[PDB]
């Protein structure tokens, strides 16, 4: 579970970050249920300071489209 | 999913940290499969600097008893 090392670059676009996050989860064969928990957690925690602050402001329970918009 | 806020105190014993991590997951009704991913990830990432460094040294794929021993 190297998912821990998938972090958002300082100037990396959230989109690019999201692509590499979910590609890693596929490899690690995560179930849709695992994919749900990781989005509410790890996706949010491994993002850059700004996005992480915006996503943490959106609240627990935001759709991926909401998070993208926010960043 | 407030699991993000369950973090290890600066001098809090790992055991105490582990109790509050898994109690929160129960409330959030996490499945055993969700409980598995969170241990390899969030449990490790929300620990204090020392433990986080030890657990990150143990490698991805360590049992909970191994992580406790390590801290």
Curated annotation (Swiss-Prot), chains A, B:
PTM: Phosphorylated possibly by host MAPK1; this phosphorylation is necessary for Pin1-mediated virion uncoating.
Compartment annotation: Virion
Superkingdom to which the source organism belongs: Viruses
Positions of the UniProt region annotated as Dimerization/Multimerization of capsid protein p24: 1-71
Subunit field text: Homodimer; the homodimer further multimerizes as homohexamers or homopentamers. Interacts with human PPIA/CYPA; This interaction stabilizes the capsid. Interacts with human NUP153. Interacts with host PDZD8; this interaction stabilizes the capsid. Interacts with monkey TRIM5; this interaction destabilizes the capsid.
Function: Forms the conical core that encapsulates the genomic RNA-nucleocapsid complex in the virion. Most core are conical, with only 7% tubular. The core is constituted by capsid protein hexamer subunits. The core is disassembled soon after virion entry. Host restriction factors such as TRIM5-alpha or TRIMCyp bind retroviral capsids and cause premature capsid disassembly, leading to blocks in reverse transcription. Capsid restriction by TRIM5 is one of the factors which restricts HIV-1 to the human species. Host PIN1 apparently facilitates the virion uncoating.
Record-given protein name: Capsid protein p24
Species the sequence originates in: Human immunodeficiency virus type 1 group M subtype B (isolate NY5)
Primary gene name: gag-pol
Parent-protein start and end of this portion: 280 to 350 of 1435
